[PDB]
Design a protein around this ligand. Sequence first.
Ligand SMILES: [Mg+2]
Ligand SMILES: [Mg+2]
Ligand SMILES: [Mg+2]
Ligand SMILES: [Mg+2]
Ligand SMILES: [Mg+2]
Ligand SMILES: [Mg+2]
Ligand SMILES: [Mg+2]
Ligand SMILES: [Mg+2]
Ligand SMILES: [Mg+2]
Ligand SMILES: [Mg+2]
Ligand SMILES: [Mg+2]
Ligand SMILES: [Mg+2]
Ligand SMILES: [Mg+2]
Ligand SMILES: [Mg+2]
Ligand SMILES: [Mg+2]
Ligand SMILES: [Mg+2]
Ligand SMILES: [Mg+2]
Ligand SMILES: [Mg+2]
Ligand SMILES: [Mg+2]
Ligand SMILES: [Mg+2]
Ligand SMILES: [Mg+2]
Ligand SMILES: [Mg+2]
Ligand SMILES: [Mg+2]
Ligand SMILES: [Mg+2]
Ligand SMILES: [Mg+2]
Ligand SMILES: [Mg+2]
Ligand SMILES: [Mg+2]
Ligand SMILES: [Mg+2]
Ligand SMILES: [Mg+2]
Ligand SMILES: [Mg+2]
Ligand SMILES: [Mg+2]
Ligand SMILES: [Mg+2]
Ligand SMILES: [Mg+2]
Ligand SMILES: [Mg+2]
Ligand SMILES: [Mg+2]
Ligand SMILES: [Mg+2]
Ligand SMILES: [Mg+2]
Ligand SMILES: [Mg+2]
Ligand SMILES: [Mg+2]
Ligand SMILES: [Mg+2]
Ligand SMILES: [Mg+2]
Ligand SMILES: [Mg+2]
Ligand SMILES: [Mg+2]
Ligand SMILES: [Mg+2]
Ligand SMILES: [Mg+2]
Ligand SMILES: [Mg+2]
Ligand SMILES: [Mg+2]
Ligand SMILES: [Mg+2]
Ligand SMILES: [Mg+2]
Ligand SMILES: [Mg+2]
Ligand SMILES: [Mg+2]
Lengths: 227, 95, 122, 46
Amino acid sequence: KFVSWKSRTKYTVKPVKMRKSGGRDHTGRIRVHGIGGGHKQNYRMIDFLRFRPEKEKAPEPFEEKVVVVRYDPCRSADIALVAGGSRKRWIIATENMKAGDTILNSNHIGRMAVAAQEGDAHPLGALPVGTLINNVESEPGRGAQYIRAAGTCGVLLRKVNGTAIIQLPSKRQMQVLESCTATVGRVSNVNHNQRVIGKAGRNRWLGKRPNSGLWKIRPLPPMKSYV
Amino acid sequence: LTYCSTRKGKRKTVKSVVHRFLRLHSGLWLRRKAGYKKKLWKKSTARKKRLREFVFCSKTQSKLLDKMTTSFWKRRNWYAGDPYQMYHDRTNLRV
Amino acid sequence: GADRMSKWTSKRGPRTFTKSRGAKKTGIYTSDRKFVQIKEMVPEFVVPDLTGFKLKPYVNYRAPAGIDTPLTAKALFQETVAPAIEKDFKEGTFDANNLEKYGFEPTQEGKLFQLYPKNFPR
Amino acid sequence: RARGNEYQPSNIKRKHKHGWVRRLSTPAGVQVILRRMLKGRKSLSH
RNA sequence: AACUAAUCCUAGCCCUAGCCCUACACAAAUAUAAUUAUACUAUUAUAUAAAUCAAAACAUUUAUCCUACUAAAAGUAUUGGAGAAAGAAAUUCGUACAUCUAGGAGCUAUAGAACUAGUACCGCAAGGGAAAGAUGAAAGACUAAUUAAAAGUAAGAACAAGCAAAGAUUAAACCUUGUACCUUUUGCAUAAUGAACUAACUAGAAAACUUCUAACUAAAAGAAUUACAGCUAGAAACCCCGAAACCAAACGAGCUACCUAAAAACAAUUUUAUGAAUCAACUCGUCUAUGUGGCAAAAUAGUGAGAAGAUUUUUAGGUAGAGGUGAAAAGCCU
RNA sequence: UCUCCAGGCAUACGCGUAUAACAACUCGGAUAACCAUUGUUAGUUAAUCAGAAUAGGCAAUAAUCACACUAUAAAUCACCUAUAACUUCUCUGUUAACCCAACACCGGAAUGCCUAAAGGAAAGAUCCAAAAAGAUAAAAGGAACUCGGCAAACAAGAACCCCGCCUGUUUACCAAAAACAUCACCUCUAGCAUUACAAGUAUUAGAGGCACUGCCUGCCCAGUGAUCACUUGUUCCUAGGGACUAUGAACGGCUAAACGAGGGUCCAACUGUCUCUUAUCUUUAAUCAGUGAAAUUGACCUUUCAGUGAAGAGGCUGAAAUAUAAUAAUAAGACGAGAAGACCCUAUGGAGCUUAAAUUAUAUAACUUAUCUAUUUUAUAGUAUAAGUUUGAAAUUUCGGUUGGGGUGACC
Ligand SMILES: [Mg+2]
Ligand SMILES: [Mg+2]
Ligand SMILES: [Mg+2]
Ligand SMILES: [Mg+2]
Ligand SMILES: [Mg+2]
Ligand SMILES: [Mg+2]
Ligand SMILES: [Mg+2]
Ligand SMILES: [Mg+2]
Ligand SMILES: [Mg+2]
Ligand SMILES: [Mg+2]
Ligand SMILES: [Mg+2]
Ligand SMILES: [Mg+2]
Ligand SMILES: [Mg+2]
Ligand SMILES: [Mg+2]
Ligand SMILES: [Mg+2]
Ligand SMILES: [Mg+2]
Ligand SMILES: [Mg+2]
Ligand SMILES: [Mg+2]
Ligand SMILES: [Mg+2]
Ligand SMILES: [Mg+2]
Ligand SMILES: [Mg+2]
Ligand SMILES: [Mg+2]
Ligand SMILES: [Mg+2]
Ligand SMILES: [Mg+2]
Ligand SMILES: [Mg+2]
Ligand SMILES: [Mg+2]
Ligand SMILES: [Mg+2]
Ligand SMILES: [Mg+2]
Ligand SMILES: [Mg+2]
Ligand SMILES: [Mg+2]
Ligand SMILES: [Mg+2]
Ligand SMILES: [Mg+2]
Ligand SMILES: [Mg+2]
Ligand SMILES: [Mg+2]
Ligand SMILES: [Mg+2]
Ligand SMILES: [Mg+2]
Ligand SMILES: [Mg+2]
Ligand SMILES: [Mg+2]
Ligand SMILES: [Mg+2]
Ligand SMILES: [Mg+2]
Ligand SMILES: [Mg+2]
Ligand SMILES: [Mg+2]
Ligand SMILES: [Mg+2]
Ligand SMILES: [Mg+2]
Ligand SMILES: [Mg+2]
Ligand SMILES: [Mg+2]
Ligand SMILES: [Mg+2]
Ligand SMILES: [Mg+2]
Ligand SMILES: [Mg+2]
Ligand SMILES: [Mg+2]
Ligand SMILES: [Mg+2]
C-alpha cells in the first residue's frame, strides 16, 4: 500500500509536499535504522543540469539572474532561485552568491583558459588547472551528482587530451571528459560543520531516532597452538 | 521384527540371520566362529583350527533364530549333491 | 464483541458509512454537491377511471369457477394468428416474408415496451 | 494496569480486517471462506 | 403416610450392499465496509510436503501417510548406518448375485453423528463448540400414571467411653475385643500419595513355536503348501489416561512496540526566553497502608514525578512468528 | 418540604431498543419498594445539523491578534485558457439511564462549553463488645522507636559522601535504577541516482563505540659524517657485483558546576515512632429482616498425661478425666488449607543462547573450467546454465560414566 511521493513528472518551483518513510520500504519493514518523525518539510525541485538551454532556444552560453538565496530543509547547502528568459528554476548556491547577481552558463569549450568567476558553469575543458569546482557530473549531460553538499569544493588536478582528473572532497581522484560541466567555487554554508546540535531533542527535530541500547582473524593451523 | 507387515500382513524374516546361520532340518543351526578371519598372524595354530570349524547353536539361540526366520527357511530342500545331505536328520537320539 | 449475525444497515457504523434501504434513485448528484431530480426517473402511477365499473373486490359464492387452463403460446397463436393465415392460405395471398402483416415483430428494438429484455416494470 | 479491555470497537477496522472483501482478496482468505461454508457456519465473515 | 428425585421409547444414527452424475429448485438484492438499481478503480493456485516418530541416542535410513486388479509365486529375489527395517516381478488363478433398492448374534438419549445445531455460547480472527425430549384412542376427555426404591433431607437434635463395629446380653448405649481403605515404599504403617457422597460411563488386542480336541493318513489340504507320521481344521495371546516439545498451513498490530498520513490539547504565575522554574488540567507510577476469590485476573486511599515538549492524546493505515518491533528490560506482538 | 454531596450538558466513536406507556410479578436487579425484568402497544420527522463534465497553462515570499519584530526545526483547491452542459430535493443518520472491562464492576474512555441555573444521596432496622481498618485530640518527654525517622508531625529547613553530565527511557502485572538513550568526541564502511538510504552526494550517508571540557603522560617515525657523503635496509645477478630507498599510538587524573521520587550520612525542627498508652467519631462487628458464595471434606461417637515410634499420637500401651447441646472470642495442634515457590538428583526428556562441537551450507561474495555470445590472430572480454574452489547468512544434531559442595586432577 506504500506509494512513493516522488510522483511529480513536471519541473516546477512550487514546493512539493514530502511524505516521510521512517526507514521502511514499500514492503513495510524497517530497512534503515534511526529515521523517524522530525519536522514536516517541503521539497523544492532542484535543477542540477546548470547548462540547460531554455525551450525553443539555441545551445549557446546564456545568463541568469539570481532572485533570492533561500534556506533548504532538504539539504545542508542553501538554494538560490535564478531567473533568465522566461524561466525560473532552483539551483545550488555557491559560497558568495547574493540576490541580484548574474551568473553565466556556457557551452563553449575555451581553447584558452577562461577567467573563473564563482557561480558560473563552464565545461571542465574551459577551466584552468587548480580551480575549485563543485556540482560535477560524471558523464556529459548526466547532471551534477558530486560535490553538491555544503562547503565542499573539488580541485581540478590535471587535463590531458579530452579527459580531466577531479579530486573529490574525500581526496579520491576521479576522471571525466572535459566536456563535462562544473560550477566554479565551493558550495554555500561553508560553516555547516561548525554547528552544535546541543540537545538530544534537536536531533529528533531532524528526523533522527536514537540508537539501539544493545551493546575475527582465524589463526591458521600452525599458529593455532601459539594463539 | 515385523509380526504383521503392512502389505501382506505376515511375519518378516530378519535377513541378517539368513546371512550368517544355516538351519538343518532336524532343528539345529550352524554358524562360524567370530574372529576366524581376524589377526591370524598372532593366533596360535590350535586357536586357528578351533576358529575354522563350523559349530552348532544352543537351545535358546536356536529358539531365537527360529523366531527371527519364517517357515520357508525351515522346509526340506532336496538339492542334488548336497554336502549336508546326511546332517538334516538325527540318528539314535534318545531323549 | 461485535454482532456478526445482525444485518449491516446505515443505522450502524460511523456517520461516513451510508447505504440505501432499497429505494430506487430518482435523480443524479451533480458536481458542486447538488441533487438534480429527473422527472422521467420518478415513477408515474397510471390510474384508470373507475366510474361505471361493475367489478368489485369479491365475487358471489354462487359464481362457478372455471376449469383451470393456463394460457400457452399455442392457445394464444390459434386465437389471434391462425384465422388470418388460414384465410390467406385459402385465398393464396400468403408468403414467409410478410409474417409481420399478421402481427410478428422481427425485433424488439424501437419498441417502447420490449418483451425481451423487459424494459418496463409490472 | 488492568487488562481485559483489549477490544476497542471500530466498525471501519472490523470490516477492513475481517470483512467479505478482505477475505476474498487472497486465495488463503478464500479458502477460509470455503472451510466455513463446508462446516455450515451461518456467518462466513464479519 | 414425602420432598428432592426415579422409571420410559423413538427422534435419529452406524456399517455394508446396490447405484455415477446430470437438482442447477419465484421476484428482487449481493464481490461496494457482500447481499447498496448504472460508469470512478481492473482481474490470476503451487516449484520437491515437512516434522513428529522408529532405530531404545542421532546424523544415511523409518511400512501406511505418498492408491492402480484379487489369490499364489513370497515375506522369496533383491534393497538397507547389510542395523532398525524395506521388498518386487516373471508367471499362474479369477464370468460375481447380475434383478428387481437389500441386509444386521449394529446403537437406543452420558449410547449412536458434534447435532433438537455447526445453533446458543466462547474467541479480534482463523477457530472451538454444548445441553436437552417422554399422558391417552381421544385434552373438542382440566396433563397420565408408576416407584420400602440413589446420594441429600424431613418425619424424629443430643445424653460419660473413644476407626464406631464385633462377641454378646433380659436390655439401644455401659462390659470385653479391636492402630480406616487403596497405592507404594525392604515383606514395615503413627509413613507419603489418592478418595465429600450418589448414579452412569471408564483400561489386555494379534497365532511363529508349543498344548488340547477331531478328519484323513505315507500322505494331508476345495490349485500354488508341508511331509523320513505327517498334514488339515477347531480351541487357546500380548491394557488405559498424562508432558514439555517438533513440523506444515492458516489467523492475528481495535492490546502493546515502532513507524506513516490527517488532526487535537496545554490555565495561572515567574524567567538569563527555554528538552528553564512554580503548579493545575493532563500523562506517569516513587513510597506507605488497605485489598489479597478484591471494586479490580494489578485496584483503592494518601503521598509523590513530568507538566511548550525526546510532551501528551485522537482517527485511519503499515510491519507477522525461520518473523516483526525494541532510547536491550532478551521487553513487547489481544 | 427539609438535610447534605459536587462533573454536568452536548458531540464523536461505540452500542442496537436497554427508549416511552400499559399489563404482569414466573426469570433478571446480588434485598424490598419500584422497575433496568416478562408480555403487548407505541417511537427517532431536516435543502440549513450529519453522511453520500473534460483537456490544457501555472506558482520563490509560513504561523504566532501579523504590525514592529526576531527566529529555526523552515511550516496548506485557487487563478487563467478553451470545450460541454443551460434549472434541482430524492436517499441515509437522529430513541435511551447506552460503550470496553464475564456483572447495574471504587477501573479504562476523545473533543466543545460551562462549575452549579445542571446532576445527585454516604445511613434496610437496631446495638455501642473484642480484634481489625480510618479520622481527630495528647499531661511530662521528644527518635529513648526501628534493620532504617517507616508512618505520622503545630515540621516540610541546612549540609556532605558514592553513582550517573543534564531533561528523557525501561522489566503492562514484585526491580524506575548506578542500566538504556543523550549532546560532544572517536573508529570503521561507501565516489553513487528513479520504491528504503534519497528525489540525498564525503561539511553526505550507514555501522558501532564512548560523558563532555580543559590538563598530563608519549608508542613513534633508518643511522654516521651533515640540500649533502658512507654504513644499513630491500631486491636481484653471481662474497663479489648491479638495482632501489626519498606532530602523535596507548593512556590516565579531573570541567565542577548544575540536576536526581537514585544509594548512604549528619544537624535543626517536628512529632503517639517510642517511654506508655488513652479518649471520641466512622467503618466493621454483634442482634433483627431479605438475599446468599469460596477454598475445603476417607469415615468420625473428633479428650489430658507418661510411654512407644521415623525429632513425630485425639485414635496404639499404661494411668487419668468425663451429663448433653448452642452463642461470642483466642490461634498451641490437626507436618492445618490454597500458588506455575525454594533446594538437590534422575531421564541415552526438552528448549534458548554461545562458539574454537560434528555434519552440511546454488544466503551472499569471489574465482577456475566448460556452455553461449560477440569480436578478435589466436587472444580478449562478457554469461538465463552445469561442474569445481574459496569464503560462511544460516540449518541440523549432541552434551558417556566414576568422582560430600566445588575446583581440580584423575580414573573406565
Ligand atoms: Mg550502547
Ligand atoms: Mg479478554
Ligand atoms: Mg486505541
Ligand atoms: Mg530414535
Ligand atoms: Mg535426548
Ligand atoms: Mg530428540
Ligand atoms: Mg532426521
Ligand atoms: Mg448425543
Ligand atoms: Mg454430544
Ligand atoms: Mg433415601
Ligand atoms: Mg464404648
Ligand atoms: Mg513428597
Ligand atoms: Mg494501531
Ligand atoms: Mg501554559
Ligand atoms: Mg521543564
Ligand atoms: Mg514538579
Ligand atoms: Mg523538577
Ligand atoms: Mg519506546
Ligand atoms: Mg541487559
Ligand atoms: Mg539479563
Ligand atoms: Mg406498573
Ligand atoms: Mg431477587
Ligand atoms: Mg425505563
Ligand atoms: Mg420492558
Ligand atoms: Mg437525543
Ligand atoms: Mg473483570
Ligand atoms: Mg440539582
Ligand atoms: Mg449502617
Ligand atoms: Mg494529630
Ligand atoms: Mg504528647
Ligand atoms: Mg536508636
Ligand atoms: Mg532499641
Ligand atoms: Mg515518612
Ligand atoms: Mg540520569
Ligand atoms: Mg529524570
Ligand atoms: Mg512504564
Ligand atoms: Mg514491573
Ligand atoms: Mg524515579
Ligand atoms: Mg515499581
Ligand atoms: Mg550506561
Ligand atoms: Mg532518581
Ligand atoms: Mg534532633
Ligand atoms: Mg439475615
Ligand atoms: Mg456428640
Ligand atoms: Mg465426645
Ligand atoms: Mg504422648
Ligand atoms: Mg487412647
Ligand atoms: Mg467458636
Ligand atoms: Mg491452631
Ligand atoms: Mg500443609
Ligand atoms: Mg540409561
